[PDB]
Design a protein around this motif. Structure first.
Motif, mmCIF file in Angstrom:
data_model
loop_
_atom_site.group_PDB
_atom_site.id
_atom_site.type_symbol
_atom_site.label_atom_id
_atom_site.label_comp_id
_atom_site.label_asym_id
_atom_site.label_seq_id
_atom_site.Cartn_x
_atom_site.Cartn_y
_atom_site.Cartn_z
ATOM 1 N N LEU A 1 3.355 -3.077 -12.181
ATOM 2 C CA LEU A 1 3.868 -4.321 -11.617
ATOM 3 C C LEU A 1 5.036 -3.915 -10.696
ATOM 4 N N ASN A 2 5.975 -3.147 -11.254
ATOM 5 C CA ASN A 2 7.205 -2.725 -10.589
ATOM 6 C C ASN A 2 7.194 -1.266 -10.222
ATOM 7 N N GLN A 3 7.608 -0.919 -8.987
ATOM 8 C CA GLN A 3 7.692 0.483 -8.574
ATOM 9 C C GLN A 3 8.677 1.267 -9.482
ATOM 10 N N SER A 4 9.648 0.571 -10.120
ATOM 11 C CA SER A 4 10.640 1.190 -11.036
ATOM 12 C C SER A 4 9.986 1.736 -12.325
ATOM 13 N N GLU A 5 8.701 1.377 -12.585
ATOM 14 C CA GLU A 5 7.924 1.890 -13.716
ATOM 15 C C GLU A 5 7.529 3.354 -13.442
ATOM 16 N N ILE A 6 7.575 3.769 -12.164
ATOM 17 C CA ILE A 6 7.199 5.109 -11.735
ATOM 18 C C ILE A 6 8.388 6.065 -11.726
ATOM 19 N N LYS A 7 8.351 7.050 -12.634
ATOM 20 C CA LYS A 7 9.324 8.134 -12.734
ATOM 21 C C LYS A 7 8.496 9.411 -12.847
ATOM 22 N N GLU A 8 9.151 10.579 -13.004
ATOM 23 C CA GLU A 8 8.464 11.868 -13.152
ATOM 24 C C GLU A 8 7.567 11.939 -14.400
ATOM 25 N N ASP A 9 7.885 11.182 -15.459
ATOM 26 C CA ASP A 9 7.078 11.186 -16.702
ATOM 27 C C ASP A 9 5.943 10.121 -16.729
ATOM 28 N N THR A 10 5.776 9.331 -15.642
ATOM 29 C CA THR A 10 4.747 8.275 -15.572
ATOM 30 C C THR A 10 3.404 8.885 -15.267
ATOM 31 N N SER A 11 2.365 8.511 -16.037
ATOM 32 C CA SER A 11 1.016 9.026 -15.818
ATOM 33 C C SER A 11 0.455 8.491 -14.502
ATOM 34 N N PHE A 12 -0.384 9.288 -13.841
ATOM 35 C CA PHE A 12 -1.019 8.937 -12.584
ATOM 36 C C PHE A 12 -2.406 9.588 -12.575
ATOM 37 N N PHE A 13 -3.217 9.270 -11.556
ATOM 38 C CA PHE A 13 -4.523 9.894 -11.332
ATOM 39 C C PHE A 13 -4.399 10.804 -10.115
ATOM 40 N N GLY A 14 -4.860 12.039 -10.271
ATOM 41 C CA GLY A 14 -4.919 12.990 -9.167
ATOM 42 C C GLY A 14 -6.122 12.636 -8.312
ATOM 43 N N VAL A 15 -6.126 13.068 -7.065
ATOM 44 C CA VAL A 15 -7.233 12.795 -6.147
ATOM 45 C C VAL A 15 -8.011 14.108 -5.906
ATOM 46 N N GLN A 16 -9.298 14.074 -6.204
ATOM 47 C CA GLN A 16 -10.210 15.181 -6.030
ATOM 48 C C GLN A 16 -10.639 15.253 -4.545
ATOM 49 N N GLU A 17 -10.892 14.090 -3.940
ATOM 50 C CA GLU A 17 -11.422 14.052 -2.589
ATOM 51 C C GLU A 17 -11.022 12.803 -1.816
#
Ligand SMILES: COC(=O)Nc1ccc2c(c1)N[C@@H](C(F)(F)F)CCCC[C@H](NC(=O)/C=C/c1cc(Cl)ccc1-n1cnnn1)c1ncc-2[nH]1
Length: 238
Positions: A62-78
């Motif tokens: 919801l909030n960009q403030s939820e994103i820190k170095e420990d926040t999970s994300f999806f890597g991009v293969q292609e």
């Protein structure tokens, strides 16, 4: 988003924020979950992007403030860019991101339906543009995901508004004649979501406009129904 309001958590669960890591981490573009390893976004977002290794996809935000170095994300293969794409203003402004891992569907992250070929003849009256973009031309990325309800505009009317451009049927326009509500910088790649028969459909991808929310300057979106076969070609490859 210009003239929008704060979204509520889980309201647009297909909405993602695509971040770039080089030179420093920051929001790049919006995107939409369309499959468990697929993000549909705008081709122009990858201008200068030399590798998918610098990309991070965050869902359930919801909030960009939820994103820190420990926040999970999806890597991009292609990164898959439409091979007729030259620039946003000429169309074919569409790209797919193949994720390195699978999205686990839930109430915070789930896919949006693509429009049906038969639904090309339907009139959508409940369309919303979402994103963390600017509230005006000179602004900054917003912390909270914003939303704005915007009416669709016919190709004929949109062409009248963009003298000097070639507005094709592979583009779809949306905006109020008096302006006031629109996408703006940082919203591109994100969805134009339309509710029809209680189902949300990915009608457009935020692409371009002359300024933000100006009177008689509708926002120009990739008309997703015209790329269903291209998306299936890339995502259903044998
Ligand atoms: C802290 O993080 C950060 O500040 N991130 C950040 C900030 C701004 C950006 C951006 C990243 N994305 C662009 C780039 F180059 F910065 F990475 C790539 C992407 C480059 C194009 C993008 N176009 C839009 O998003 C939408 C345009 C648009 C669409 C409609 Cl439908 C109507 C009016 C529109 N506008 C006309 N003029 N402005 N908007 C954009 N321009 C700046 C940005 N994005």
């Amino acid at each position: 988003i210009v003239g929008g309001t704060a979204s509520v958590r889980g309201e647009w669960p297909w909405q993602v924020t695509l971040h770039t890591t080089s030179p420093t981490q920051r929001h790049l573009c919006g995107g939409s979950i369309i499959g468990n390893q697929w993000i549909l976004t705008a081709a122009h977002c990858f201008y200068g992007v030399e590798s998918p290794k610098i990309l991070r996809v965050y869902s359930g935000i919801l909030n960009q403030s939820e994103i820190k170095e420990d926040t999970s994300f999806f890597g991009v293969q292609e990164i898959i860019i439409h091979d007729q794409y030259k620039m946003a203003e000429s169309g074919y402004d569409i790209a797919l991101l193949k994720l390195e891992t699978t999205v686990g569907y839930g109430d915070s992250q789930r896919p949006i339906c693509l429009p049906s070929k038969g639904d090309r003849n339907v009139i959508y009256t409940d369309c919303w543009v979402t994103g963390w973009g600017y509230r005006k031309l000179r602004d900054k990325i917003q912390n909270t995901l914003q939303k704005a309800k915007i009416p669709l505009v016919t190709n004929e009317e949109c062409q009248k508004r963009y003298r000097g451009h070639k507005i094709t049927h592979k583009m779809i326009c949306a905006g109020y004649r008096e302006g006031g509500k629109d996408a703006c910088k940082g919203d591109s790649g994100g969805p134009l979501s339309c509710k029809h028969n209680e189902v949300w459909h990915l009608v457009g991808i935020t692409s371009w406009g002359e300024g933000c929310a100006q009177r008689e300057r509708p926002g120009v979106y990739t008309n997703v129904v015209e790329y269903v076969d291209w998306i299936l070609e890339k995502t259903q490859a044998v």
